[PDB]
């Protein structure tokens, strides 16, 4: 409907999944708030608009259409008011910085060592499948109480939930263009229920120190637990992004460092720079790229667009983190960029609840990797492909080292 943006009618979902940065570079210049037809939604592409929408008192959280189809209600990302406050109070205890500092090292470092010892003498590895994803899912899985669920299964689940919740394409009538793409999300949820329902049965009667046991029991009257249907959508939210993103963030950081070999050497020589390297990695390729949204609660004007009440806006934080109003040459990974604010963890009342935990998981994993394989090199015979619009990360990362 906006005439000068008629080129957006020809943008495809495949194009956005393969590489969204060219389209979003145009959006940031032409229309920082723009209706993208294949997504069926307004999209915020600049840091200023994303931050305004994410923190505005005239917006509240809304789940994306494909996210709602995947997760249902009450997904912590899609609710507000009293339910959101309860769900935040439910998840926040184990994520509190003082609590994380008590046990994060004894959690992650032995896991990292376990996966490293499977390949650290091979001279070759595919780090996404062999290290970054396993460490990410095993760390969170143990925290949650899913010790018995193999890392391969956790990885499969987040992949299916990723594809289902980002199955956003709509057709000429605004209907989902690929409804069969939700089937694997439904199958993952069915498998998750089969594994987790017996665990919940047990935790209700025999609480333990697992996070999900605490979700059932914390803050409840004596002998009562939160209904499992009330907490399952947030379990699913964890089994997608909480499981996937630390691995994506570590992997993207490594790809970025490999692209700047002098900076890789600096970080290997001085591991106190790992946190800075990760923060630049998250800006450079944001793991949660465009997966959340807000909805206006009253008429509002944003970036010159008059929006009615009830208008959803997707928050494309991954684009905002390449805003050239803020960053010079943002498509280049640069460890020595000044430590400016970034939006890879979102903003506002629905900002990431697990930042401190996530940053430590990624730090410890990279510390142990560089200690075990100080002469790590990228295998330049193999290409690194990034994939994803909603969630983005490298699909593989082949490396080599002299043994």
Ligand X SMILES: COc1cccc(CO)c1O
User: In which element (H, E) is residue 293 found?
Assistant: strand 292-296
Dihedral sign, CA of 108, 149, 392, 312?
negative
Q: Tell me if 350 is assigned to a ligand binding site.
A: yes
Binding part of the chain for ligand X, among 80-88, 132-140, 288-296, 364-372 by CB under 6 A, reads: 288-296
Site for ligand X in 154-173 (CB under 6 A): 165
Residue 165 binding: pick among ligand X, ligand HEM, none (C-beta 5-8 Å cut-off by kind)? ligand X
Three-class DSSP category at 307: strand
Residue from the set 358, 369, 397, 399 that interacts with ligand HEM by CB under 6 A: 358
CA dist 165 and 189 (Å) reads: 12
> Is the distance from CB of 29 to CB of 21 less than 8 angstroms?
no
C-alpha to C-alpha distance for 400 and 380, rounded to whole angstroms: 9
Determine if residue 88 is labeled as part of a ligand binding site: yes
Kindly write down the DSSP assignment for every residue of 290-327, as one continuous string.
Answer: S-EEEEESS-EEETTEEEPTT-EEEE-HHHHTT-TTT-
291 binds ligand X (CB under 6 A): yes
Q: Alpha-carbon distance 177 to 169, whole Å?
A: 6
Q: What gap in Å lies between CA 244 and CA 134, rounded to an integer?
A: 10
Q: Among 38, 352, 365, 369, indicate the residue that binds ligand HEM (CB under 6 A).
A: 352
- Pairwise CA distance, residues 272 & 274, whole Å: 6
Q: Does 77 bind ligand X (CB under 6 A)?
A: yes
- Residue closest to ligand HEM when measured from CB atoms: 346
CB of 222 to ligand HEM, least distance (A): 27
Nearer to ligand X, 241 or 256 (CB): 241
| Helix (H) / strand (E) containing 140 | helix 133-144
Please report which residue ranges of 206-242 form alpha helices under DSSP H. Answer: 211-217, 228-237
Q: Binding string, 214-253, against ligand HEM, x = CB under 6 A? A: ---------------------------xx--xx--x----
How far apart are CB 249 and ligand HEM at their closest, in Å?
4
Distance between CA atoms of residues 201 and 331, nearest Å: 48
- What whole-number distance in Å separates Cα of residue 70 and Cα of residue 239? 12
State which residue, 111 or 242, has the beta carbon closest to ligand HEM. 242
Q: How far is the CB of 296 from ligand HEM (least distance, A)?
A: 15
240 in contact with ligand X (CB under 6 A): yes
* Closest residue by Cα to residue 289 from 254, 252, 258: 252
Minimum distance from residue 247 beta carbon to ligand X (Å): 13
Taking only Cα atoms into account, the Rg of the chain, rounded to an integer number of angstroms, comes to: 21
Binding ligand HEM by CB under 6 A: which of 59, 115, 317, 333? 317
Q: 97 CB contacts (<8 Å, ≥6 apart)?
A: 356
Helix (H, G, I), strand (E, B) or coil at 282: helix
Q: Which of 167, 263, 286, 292 binds ligand X (CB under 6 A)?
A: 292
Residue 241 annotated as binding? yes
Q: Which stretch binds ligand X (CB under 6 A): 2-10, 145-153, 221-229, 285-293?
A: 285-293
The full length of the chain comes to: 403
The residue within the footprint of ligand HEM, chosen from 34, 76, 168, 302 (CB under 6 A), is: 76
x/- site string to ligand X, residues 177 to 216, per CB under 6 A? ----------------------------------------
Q: Does 67 bind ligand HEM (CB under 6 A)?
A: no
**Segment near ligand HEM (CB under 6 A), from 88-96, 123-131, 190-198, 251-259?**
88-96
β strands within 185-268, DSSP E: none
Q: Which residues pair with 41 in a beta bridge?
A: 36
- Applying CB under 6 A, among 54, 108, 288, 364 the residue interacting with ligand X is 288
Query: Rounded to whole angstroms, what are the CA distances from 352 to 88, 192, 300?
Result: 10, 23, 25
Binding site for ligand HEM (CB under 6 A): 54, 76-77, 88, 91, 95, 140, 241-242, 245-246, 249, 282, 287-288, 292, 315, 317, 344-348, 350-354, 357-358
Q: Which residues bind ligand X (CB under 6 A)?
A: 67, 77, 165, 237-238, 240-242, 288, 291-292
Q: Which residues are annotated as a binding site for heme?
A: 84, 88, 294, 317, 347, 350, 352
């Amino acid at each position: 409907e906006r005439p000068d943006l008629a080129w957006l009618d020809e943008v495809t979902m495949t194009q956005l999944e393969r590489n969204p940065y060219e389209v979003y570079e145009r959006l940031r210049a032409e229309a920082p708030l723009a209706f993208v037809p294949v997504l069926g939604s307004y999209v915020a592409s600049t840091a200023e608009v994303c931050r305004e929408v994410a923190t505005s008192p005239d917006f509240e959280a809304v789940i994306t259409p494909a996210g709602g189809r995947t997760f249902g209600h009450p997904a912590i990302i899609g609710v507000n008011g009293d339910i959101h406050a309860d769900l935040r109070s439910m998840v926040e205890p184990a994520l509190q910085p003082a609590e994380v500092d008590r046990w994060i090292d004894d959690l992650v470092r032995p896991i990292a060592r376990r996966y490293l010892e499977r390949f650290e003498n091979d001279g070759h590895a595919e780090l996404v499948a062999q290290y970054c994803e396993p460490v990410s899912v095993r760390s969170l899985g143990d925290l949650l109480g899913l010790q018995e669920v193999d890392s391969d299964k956790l990885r499969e689940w987040f992949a299916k939930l990723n594809r289902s919740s980002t199955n956003a394409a709509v057709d000429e009538n605004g209907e989902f263009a690929n409804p069969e793409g939700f089937a694997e999300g439904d199958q993952a949820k069915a498998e998750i229920r089969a594994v987790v329902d017996p665990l919940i049965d047990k935790w209700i009667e025999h609480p333990d120190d697992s996070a999900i046991s605490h979700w059932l029991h914390d803050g409840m009257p004596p002998g009562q637990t939160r209904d499992r249907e009330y907490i399952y959508p947030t379990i699913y939210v964890y089994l997608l992004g909480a499981m996937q993103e630390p691995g994506h963030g570590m992997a993207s950081t490594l790809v970025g460092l490999f692209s700047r070999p002098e900076q890789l050497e600096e970080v290997v020589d001085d591991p106190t720079l790992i946190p800075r390297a990760i923060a630049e990695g998250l800006r450079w390729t944001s793991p949660i790229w465009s997966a959340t949204a807000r909805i206006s609660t009253k008429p509002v004007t944003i970036a010159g667009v008059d929006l009615p009440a009830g208008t959803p806006v997707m928050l494309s934080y991954g684009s905002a983190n390449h805003d050239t109003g803020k960053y010079e040459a943002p498509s280049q990974y640069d460890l020595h960029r000044p430590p400016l604010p970034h939006l890879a963890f979102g903003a506002g009342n629905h900002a990431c609840a697990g930042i401190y935990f996530a940053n430590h998981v990624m730090r410890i994993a990279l510390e142990e990797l560089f200690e075990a394989i100080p002469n790590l090199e990228r295998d330049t015979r193999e290409g690194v492909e990034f994939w994803g619009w909603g969630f983005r990360g490298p699909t593989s990362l082949h490396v080599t080292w002299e043994v």
